[PDB]
Ligand binder design. Structure first.
Ligand SMILES: C[C@H](CCC(=O)NCCC[N+](C)(C)C[C@H](O)CS(=O)(=O)O)[C@H]1CC[C@H]2[C@@H]3[C@H](O)C[C@@H]4C[C@H](O)CC[C@]4(C)[C@H]3C[C@H](O)[C@]12C
Ligand SMILES: C[C@H](CCC(=O)NCCC[N+](C)(C)C[C@H](O)CS(=O)(=O)O)[C@H]1CC[C@H]2[C@@H]3[C@H](O)C[C@@H]4C[C@H](O)CC[C@]4(C)[C@H]3C[C@H](O)[C@]12C
Ligand SMILES: C[C@H](CCC(=O)NCCC[N+](C)(C)C[C@H](O)CS(=O)(=O)O)[C@H]1CC[C@H]2[C@@H]3[C@H](O)C[C@@H]4C[C@H](O)CC[C@]4(C)[C@H]3C[C@H](O)[C@]12C
Ligand SMILES: [Mg+2]
Lengths: 552, 1336
């Protein structure tokens, strides 16, 4: 191929063919001249070498090289090696009618639709717009339609909205580990340049909103459109194919909202009140006359399919909080009332969705998930739950425990210095002492953090579960666990070594306090190892999955 | 004392710990290395002198002619830095060396010579380093990163018993030279000592001994001790030898010494030595398995009874006894300690003499050739022992001597025999349980190469090529009348230098995101590159942080990805040893006092000391406070008594790099989050207006100044003139250099493009008449604020969910942040239109274009080039160009169309530069380059005229400044008579020369100064001519291109949903919404919140330094608001003085102490004005501010010590429950903009061989549909979607073209066919000679 400036670009096969032809012609010339046998034998060896390098370069004496010092690519090298036709172009190839962009949240969406930029939609659906413009007479020819879309006339946007009406688009994220990495959504034209992704599907994609990008493809044929609508739609794939559990469970902020709403405290506004139903509960809460955590009695009516699908109703006076009664207004008919009569952490919500799916069906569950998401977001916002430094309450008896551990380890060390215990025994003894100290510190921290005193209906002390923001996040399943809180407010703990051993002396400082420069080096020791192990695990898992799909 | 630039706005400093050592010049490694490279060194050991002395002199065959070297020099570059960058040429200097050819005659070689020819020869141009540590190679600034490589010397290691099933460690040694081969000794599983030369086939080790003219007896004498048997059958005994299970116990003094069976003990040895036991008798059976030491013959017949190193038997003993031999020598051995290793190899060694060993080595070296005695001798003697072919550099020799425990630092770069003998002896000693192996990750074993050495190596390579060429030329002929200039070809020398500087792995485009990115790129250590390990061959052994990294390499800042731990960053105080080893400073400790003298210790030298910690309490007299102090000994750390510590750390920052020292509250962040925070902080994009951090660490000023972005005063003075593009300083009289005028002019760098297409712009920060002093800043660069680094903006932030618009890491931003253009950036991009000459004819740049109806020609001038300053949007034409075309061959139904409408063909195709879609900026610069033959158009001449006017103006300024100094000199020599201190000044300045005093030194000096004045005038006329020639000369364009037009567009990007924003604590996110102001949460005063952040991100990612930063920023802004309220009521300066004084002294005995009693009222008011937006605060890395200090600072203002307030909902006005945390956080705008990431395609251009859509956004390519996506579509039942992906969308030509027509016809159906990739595969397989076919 010619390039600009008289320069050319060529394949390596031209050089190999030229060499073969040159040596063949020289051999014919030598046979013509009746040369001595030595010369013709050498020429024949050279011809053999040239042909074998043409067919396959590497597997012989070294390998011929070009003008630069890289080996020439032979015919065989063009078929194999992960850069050949079999694996580089015949199974994975670039496609038209595709785009990519960053992703944002768009919490207002419904489970079956996604927000698509208007300019991306205009570029992707261009032939459809030309067809619509010509069909309705707004353009005489396809050239006129092209000019109209290029100038972005007013009618072009109406035509685009008509074209996009019911036409799914496949969204995909690069590490496609399972079949839920590609899903079909209905486009919703938006401004800007970022795709909006429904929160509930994020876990399916394993996607967050800190810089991730997604690719969008558009089906063309009627069969492709119907497959996207009936097979790949996001409202069809709500159960995991690995196990029958749901995979659209609310993740972190919905869980916090629903946990805060469904939760009781000892003494709140309007305790002991008797309500006529959920609507009166919501009216009282919004009027400011009652608290969202107020133990009242509410007249609840619940339906049951205790027949051949009849939904018989039962009305009673339940004992619940205002928040639970308010939340009951989104639950469908057939479900009982005991599902929403608890704290509703992370697992309770998943169990509730699973029960809804198994008792009622698919469409009610799809509506229920959206209602759950909206309510959780709304009430998490309304709670105003934040995080401060004073929320990380360190035990008041941590220093005493550390002093006790130090005294015991000093005793063990001086005992060893007197030749009563061997090195291994004393090392194990010190490890055990520090482990016990860490366990005691963690127990004290958690016991101090998981309860609070509130008074009262009459004026007496009464314990209750704490409303600490850190504890609420950890306990509801929204985010965090015991280890994170231990590191924040307990002691960072016991570290390891590059050898894999355990350092006898632990990091006795948490992150609310600071780690001195010597304690912060042992942490860097382990962070690097963590990152390297993550990379290695990704590579190994990919290789295993490829070998596993090859066989089956 | 406070600096004038630092007295405008003092940053309140916590950090109780004192400072003893100030941060050194940050980018001093690069400058030092390259300075050493190009430098006239009297005793050539650095740079070009070393290379010339190492290669030259060059001698021909028989020494008939000799080529000598005299000296070298570098001329001034033809183009300076700015011109080189403008016209895309390297900034380099020509290396001119004066050589001398001497020709010898017949007769006596050492004596008279026929003649000598000395001449200067030019050999290549060497690139020069800019005063900031960068190279301009092809108009782009490059950086050459140092390399961390294993130093030459001898290293002993083991395989840890993993390469064999038995799991037995196999020790080995290796001698690594600076250049040469690798002599490795190794232990075979059977304990046989083998040797390899270039990792090739193994050979018995002792063969090399036979190659060094050693006999078997000498070998055994060196590698073994001796035992003597005397005859009857009496043997001398050494008590120490029998340490330890004996066949025959003892026979000493006859009676008894010890019984049989019992193992010998220490008491037995003590008894034997006390009794003076020297000889004993042992049974002949005791000598059954011994090995004879030396050869034994028979005097009767001269027959070899037994050869050395042979098994000994009873019959041999009897033969020796009857042959008259009484003293028999055997080899002292011991299965445990002194195991037999050399003897077994000898018994397994095929060779018998030197010739056999040499032939074996030759056959192993270059197999297939017939060995020869002379050839083998030459090959072995040239493999090592030869200066030209083997070099063990001074560092290599030093490490070699130290490893073998020698006191000689210096020596020779060639291995001797003693060296190899000692290496083998030490390897054996290690095998015998005495000695330790070497660690390879130890920073005492790894060295640093810099630019001035990596360039020297390449230059010497080129010089060796030249040596070969010239020696070949002198081999034949040696004719006379041959100057020393027809033998030297410049191209071979310049080849290596050009290849290294231009196309190398360690030479890379600089990072110009901001000053921090430049600083951290210049001081970067890489383990990759030539002569270093590779990514796919580096395990976690080298990717981990070693205990020796403490104070030399940062453990936090390292890339995360394919190469983590292979690229690191130099620490803050780290320095390079004389040999290339990192060293770090420690403050010495005398008997009990911590003196203030710093010693720089290296990794190896640091092990054998006890080094205290920087955070160690010290009395005012220097004595330690605590009785026990925590110190880090050889390998670990523990408490040590006060009186056995000999060093102390010089600071609390010396463990971290500059990037990680800018994170406040670093010790409250998890290591992963700190790593991410540094890596992202390197990516911040400068914004329209700089905003200093309200919470910093005190390292901002150093990073700002030590970077070249600011303009720093060289000498103090008074600001004579200020302007948007220049500063004229009038120097003080104390530092005038009396021969000089005394004024300095700084020309600021206005809007200019960087490597990342951002904007570089310097603006002054001084006013008329403002005094300045040396080291003060005069013009802030990009991302600096009054000399402090300012990478982002202080935003009012709240932590709460707010309706799921910050769900995972999304960020909710206010419209008040977009209205005020706080995160708006300017980007500059150049577009080039190249007019070449094609076969059909030349391409014309013209305003007359076919098929354009004057709508797109509005912005084009009469020459077809867009007007400067024009606002252009996507699709507009910037430069109008047309290319000649050939016949078109109109089709039927188109011939008829033209016939009907009678429109002829244009005959020129429209190929004109146009703005890329989606871009909209203003043309800020247009520049045109024309070939020397082509004629300039109107626009080029206009640009040339403007340039000429500017050059004339600048040169006039320079001349006017220079003449003042000469006039001063004239006035100086007219003092001792004929001087009118009052009258003279009023008359014209040019009459100084007219007056004459007398025929004395004064008149002669006046005449000489007049001649100098005339010379200066002529010189500046010459310089004006030179500038004119430079402007008007033709350009060295590429072959075939007639001209080039470059147009620069300045886009101004705002912040929009999808843009990436992050803090300094590894907390990134993507903007999700631009909320209206009346919807944002607000407090009781009605002030909204700029940004809302999700609290759920804090617990899991344990980076709680952001909460502390938020609280401290709230405190600082509260202090600033109180100052602003005081200042806006026009209160007396006494109140402001009192408040600012009581706000500058808080905390538990901080080191900073500012006294406002020494501030004049104007200075106090200036400081208060600079503090009304918030008081800056400094929080050193591991010496920051305690929580109690934050609470007290909050209480100084009227803020709640909890850091939390009650917020109201903007939408409804109902207050949020459980108050929320609000404060101020420093947000950055990372260079990941959604404008550069949105790409969509429907159809475009396709590749050539395999007809598939091209790839990438620039190519308008498609999205790769990999194999895992195919598996995903197979997991569904989507067969038609997959098929249309595979055929109609990618590489089915007829199918893809029919699908388009079907779609535009409202028919959604496909007739796929077969992809072109399978056809290419079939043809390729048929070419292989196979017959693959499609049946029916
Ligand atoms: C994307 C790629 C660099 C990727 C980093 C850039 C850098 C130089 C560009 C090519 C060269 O100009 C040679 C040639 C010129 C022809 O005119 C058009 C094709 C070629 C291949 C160009 C296309 C592409 O743009 C190249 C490969
Ligand atoms: C004189 C100075 C110490 C006094 C010795 C000690 C180590 C020597 C350097 C390195 O060893 C090798 C390196 C590559 C080449 O060998 C020549 C250049 C380098 C920098 C050497 C120059 C000089 O010889 C050095 C600095
Ligand atoms: C990036 C690539 C190797 C990676 C480094 C380097 C190595 C040699 C470079 C090309 C050659 O110069 C020839 C040609 C010069 C013209 O300008 C047109 C572009 C071409 C193709 C260049 C683009 C690019 O720069 C190349 C491919
Ligand atoms: Mg992510």
């Amino acid at each position: 191929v010619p390039l600009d400036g008289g320069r050319f670009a060529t394949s390596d096969l031209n050089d190999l063919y030229r060499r073969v032809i040159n040596r063949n012609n020289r051999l014919k010339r030598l046979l013509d001249l009746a040369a001595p046998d030595i010369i013709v034998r050498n020429e024949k060896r050279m011809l053999q070498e040239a042909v074998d390098a043409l067919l396959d370069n590497g597997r012989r004496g070294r390998a011929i090289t070009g003008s630069n010092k890289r080996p020439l690519k032979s015919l065989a090298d063009m078929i194999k090696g992960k850069q050949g036709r079999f694996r580089q172009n015949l199974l994975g190839k670039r496609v038209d009618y595709s785009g990519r962009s960053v992703i944002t949240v768009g919490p207002y969406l419904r489970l079956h639709q996604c927000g698509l930029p208007k300019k991306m939609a205009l570029e992707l659906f261009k032939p459809f717009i030309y067809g619509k413009l010509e069909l309705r007479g707004l353009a005489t020819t396809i050239k006129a339609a092209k000019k109209m879309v290029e100038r972005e006339e007013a009618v072009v946007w109406d035509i685009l909205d008509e074209v996009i009406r019911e036409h799914p688009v496949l969204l995909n994220r690069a590490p496609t580990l399972h079949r839920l990495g590609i899903q079909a959504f209905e486009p919703v034209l938006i401004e800007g340049k970022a795709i909006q992704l429904h929160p509930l599907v994020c876990a399916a994609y394993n996607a967050d909103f800190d810089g991730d990008q997604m690719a969008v493809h558009v089906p063309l044929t009627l069969e492709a459109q119907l497959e996207a609508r009936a097979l790949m739609m996001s409202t069809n794939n709500i159960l995991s194919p690995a196990n029958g559990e749901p995979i659209i469970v609310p993740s972190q902020d919905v869980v916090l909202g629903l946990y805060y709403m469904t939760r009781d405290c000892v003494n709140a506004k309007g305790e002991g009140m008797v309500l006529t139903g959920p609507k009166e509960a919501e009216r009282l809460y919004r009027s400011g006359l009652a608290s969202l955590h107020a133990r009242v009695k509410v007249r609840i009516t619940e339906y049951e399919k205790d027949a051949n699908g009849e939904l018989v109703a039962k009305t009673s006076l339940k004992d619940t909080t205002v928040g639970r009664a308010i939340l009951w207004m989104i639950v469908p008919k057939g479900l009982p009332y005991s599902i929403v009569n608890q704290a509703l952490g992370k697992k309770a919500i998943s169990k509730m969705l699973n029960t809804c799916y198994r008792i009622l069906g698919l469409k009610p569950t799809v509506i229920f998930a959206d209602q759950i998401m909206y309510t959780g977001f709304a009430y998490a916002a309304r709670s105003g739950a934040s995080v401060g430094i004073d929320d990380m309450v360190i035990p008041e008896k941590k220093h005493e425990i550390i002093s006790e551990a130090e005294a015991e380890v000093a005793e063990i060390q001086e005992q060893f210095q007197s030749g009563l215990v061997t090195a291994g025994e004393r090392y194990n003894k010190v490890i055990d002492i520090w482990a016990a100290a860490n366990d005691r510190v963690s127990k004290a921290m958690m016991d101090n953090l998981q309860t609070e005193t509130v008074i009262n209906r009459d004026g007496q002390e009464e314990k209750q579960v704490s409303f600490n923001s850190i504890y609420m996040m950890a306990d509801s399943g929204a985010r965090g666990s015991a280890a994170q809180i231990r590191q924040l407010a307990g002691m960072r703990g016991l570290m390891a070594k590059p050898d894999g051993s355990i350092i006898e002396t632990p990091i006795t400082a948490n992150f609310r306090e600071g780690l001195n420069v010597l304690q912060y080096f042992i942490s860097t020791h382990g962070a690097r190892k963590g990152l390297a192990d993550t990379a290695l695990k990704t590579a190994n898992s990919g290789y295993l999955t490829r070998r596993l799909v090859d066989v089956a | 004392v406070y600096s004038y630039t630092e007295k405008k706005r003092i940053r309140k400093d916590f950090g109780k710990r004192p400072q003893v050592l100030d941060v050194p010049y940050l980018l001093s490694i690069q400058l030092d290395s390259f300075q050493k490279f190009i430098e006239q060194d009297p005793e050539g050991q650095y740079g070009l002198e070393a290379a010339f002395r190492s290669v030259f002199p060059i001698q021909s065959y028989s020494g008939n002619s000799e080529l000598q070297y005299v000296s070298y020099r570098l001329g001034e570059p033809v183009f300076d830095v700015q011109e080189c960058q403008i016209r895309g040429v390297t900034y380099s200097a020509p290396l001119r060396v004066k050589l001398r050819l001497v020709i010898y005659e017949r007769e006596a070689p050492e004596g008279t010579v026929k003649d000598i020819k000395e001449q200067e020869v030019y050999m290549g141009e060497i690139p020069l380093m800019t005063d900031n540590g960068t190279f301009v190679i092809n108009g782009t600034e490059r950086v050459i990163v140092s390399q961390l490589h294993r130093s030459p010397g001898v290293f002993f290691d083991s395989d840890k018993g993993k390469t064999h099933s038995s799991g037995k460690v196999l020790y080995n040694a290796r001698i690594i030279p600076y250049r040469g081969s690798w002599l490795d000794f190794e232990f075979d599983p059977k304990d046989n000592l083998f040797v390899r030369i270039d990792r090739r086939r193994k050979l018995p080790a002792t063969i090399i001994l036979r190659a060094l003219n050693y006999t078997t007896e000498q070998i055994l004498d060196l590698f073994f001790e001796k035992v003597i048997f005397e005859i009857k059958l009496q043997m001398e005994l050494v008590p120490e030898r029998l340490r330890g299970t004996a066949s025959f116990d003892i026979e000493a003094n006859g009676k008894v010494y010890v019984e049989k069976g019992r193992r010998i003990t220490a008491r037995h040895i003590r008894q034997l030595e006390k009794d003076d036991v020297k000889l004993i008798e042992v049974p002949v059976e005791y000598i059954a398995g011994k090995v004879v030491a030396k050869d034994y013959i028979d005097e009767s017949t001269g027959e070899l009874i037994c050869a050395a190193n042979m098994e000994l038997s009873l019959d041999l003993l009897a033969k020796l006894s009857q042959s008259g031999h009484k003293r028999i020598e055997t080899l002292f051995t011991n299965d445990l300690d002194h195991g037999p290793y050399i003897s077994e190899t000898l018994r397994v060694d095929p060779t018998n003499d030197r010739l056999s060993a040499l032939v074996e080595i030759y056959r192993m070296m270059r197999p297939g050739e017939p060995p020869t005695r002379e050839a083998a001798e030459s090959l072995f003697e040239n493999l090592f022992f030869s200066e030209d072919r083997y070099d063990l550099s001074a560092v290599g020799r030093m490490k070699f001597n130290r490893s073998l425990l020698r006191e000689e630092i210096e020596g020779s770069g060639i291995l001797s025999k003693d060296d190899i003998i000692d290496v083998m002896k030490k390897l054996i000693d290690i095998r015998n349980g005495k000695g330790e192996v070497d660690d390879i990750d130890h920073l005492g074993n790894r060295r640093i190469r810099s630019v001035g050495e990596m360039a020297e190596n390449q230059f010497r390579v080129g010089l060796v090529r030249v040596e070969r060429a010239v020696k070949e030329r002198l081999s034949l002929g040696d004719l006379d009348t041959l100057m020393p200039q027809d033998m030297i070809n410049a191209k071979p020398i310049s080849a290596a230098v050009k290849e290294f500087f231009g196309s190398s792995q360690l030479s890379q485009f600089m990072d110009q995101n901001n000053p921090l990115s430049e600083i951290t790129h210049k001081r970067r250590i890489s383990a990759l590159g030539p002569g270093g390990l590779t990514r796919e061959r580096a395990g976690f052994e080298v990717r981990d942080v070693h205990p020796t990294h403490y104070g030399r390499v940062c453990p936090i800042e390292t890339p995360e990805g394919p190469n983590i731990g292979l690229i690191n960053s130099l620490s803050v105080y780290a320095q390079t040893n004389e040999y290339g080893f990192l060293e770090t400073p420690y403050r010495k400790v005398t008997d009990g006092v911590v003196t203030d003298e710093i010693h720089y210790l290296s990794a190896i030298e640091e092990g054998n000391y006890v080094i205290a910690q920087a955070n160690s309490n010290l009395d005012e007299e220097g004595h330690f406070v605590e009785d026990l102090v925590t110190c880090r000994s050889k390998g670990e750390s523990s408490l040590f008594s006060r009186d056995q510590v000999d060093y102390m750390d010089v600071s609390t920052q010396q463990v971290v790099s500059v990037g990680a020292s800018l994170i406040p509250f670093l010790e409250h962040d998890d290591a992963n989050r700190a790593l991410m925070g540094a890596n992202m902080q390197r990516q911040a994009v400068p914004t329209l207006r700089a905003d200093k951090p309200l919470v910093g660490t005190g390292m901002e000023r150093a990073v700002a100044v030590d970077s070249g972005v600011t303009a720093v005063a060289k000498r103090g003075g008074v600001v004579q003139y200020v302007d948007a593009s220049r500063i004229v300083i009038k120097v003080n009289e104390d530092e005038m250099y009396p021969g000089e005028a005394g004024i300095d002019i700084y020309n600021l760098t206005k809007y200019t493009r960087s490597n990342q297409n951002t904007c570089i712009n310097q603006m002054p920060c001084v006013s008329l008449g403002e005094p300045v002093e040396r080291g003060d800043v005069l013009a802030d660069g990009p991302s600096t604020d009054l000399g402090e680094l300012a990478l982002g903006q202080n935003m009012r932030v709240a932590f709460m969910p707010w309706n799921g618009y910050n769900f995972e890491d999304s960020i909710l931003v206010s419209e008040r942040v977009v209205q005020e253009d706080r995160f708006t950036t300017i980007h500059i991009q150049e577009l080039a239109c190249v007019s070449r000459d094609t076969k059909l004819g030349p391409e014309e740049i013209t305003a007359d274009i076919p098929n354009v109806g004057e709508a797109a020609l509005s912005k084009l001038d009469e020459s077809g080039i867009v007007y400067i300053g024009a606002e252009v949007t996507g699709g507009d034409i910037l430069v109008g160009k047309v290319t000649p075309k050939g016949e078109t061959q109109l089709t039927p139904e188109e011939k008829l169309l033209r016939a009907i409408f009678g429109e002829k063909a244009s005959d020129v195709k429209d190929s004109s530069l146009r703005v890329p879609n989606g871009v909209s900026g203003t043309v800020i610069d247009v520049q045109v380059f024309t070939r020397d033959g082509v004629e300039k158009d109107k626009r080029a001449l206009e640009i040339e005229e403007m340039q000429l006017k500017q050059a004339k103006k600048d040169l006039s300024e320079e001349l006017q400044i220079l003449e003042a100094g000469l006039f001063s000199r004239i006035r100086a020599v007219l003092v001792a008579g004929g001087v009118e201190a009052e009258k003279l000044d009023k008359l014209p300045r040019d009459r100084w020369l007219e007056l004459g005093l007398t025929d004395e030194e004064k008149q002669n000096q006046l005449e000489q100064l007049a001649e100098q004045y005339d010379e200066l005038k002529h010189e500046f006329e010459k310089k004006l001519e030179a500038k004119r020639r430079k402007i008007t000369q033709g350009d060295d364009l590429a072959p075939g291109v007639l001209k080039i037009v470059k147009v620069y567009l300045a886009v101004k990007r705002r912040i929009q949903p999808g843009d990436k924003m992050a803090g300094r604590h590894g907390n990134k996110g993507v903007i999700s919404k631009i909320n209206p102001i009346e919807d944002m949460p607000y407090d009781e005063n009605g002030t909204p919140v700029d940004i809302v952040l999700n609290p759920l991100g804090v617990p899991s990612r344990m980076n709680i330094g952001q909460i502390l930063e938020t609280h401290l920023g709230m405190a600082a802004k509260g202090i600033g608001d109180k100052i602003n309220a005081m200042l806006k009521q026009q209160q007396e300066v006494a109140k402001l003085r009192e408040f600012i004084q009581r706000a500058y002294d808080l905390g538990a005995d901080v080191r900073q102490k500012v006294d406002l009693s020494t501030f004049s009222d104007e200075e106090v008011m200036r400081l208060a004005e600079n503090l009304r937006k918030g008081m800056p605060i400094a929080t050193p890395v591991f010496d920051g501010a305690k929580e109690a200090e934050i609470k007290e600072l909050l209480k100084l203002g009227d803020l709640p010590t909890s850091g939390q307030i009650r917020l109201y909902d903007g939408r409804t006005g109902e207050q949020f429950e459980r108050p929320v945390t609000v404060g101020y956080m420093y947000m950055l705008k990372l260079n990941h903009l959604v404008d550069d990431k949105m790409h969509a395609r429907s159809t475009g251009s396709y590749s050539l061989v395999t007809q598939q859509p091209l790839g990438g956004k620039a190519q308008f390519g498609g999205q790769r549909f990999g194999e895992m996506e195919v598996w995903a579509l197979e997991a569904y039942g989507a067969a038609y979607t997959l098929q249309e992906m595979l055929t109609v969308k990618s590489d089915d030509v007829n199918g893809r073209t029919k699908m388009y027509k079907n779609i535009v016809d409202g028919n959604h159906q496909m007739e796929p066919g077969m992809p072109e990739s399978f056809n290419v595969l079939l043809k390729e397989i048929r070419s292989l000679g196979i017959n693959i076919e499609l049946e029916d």
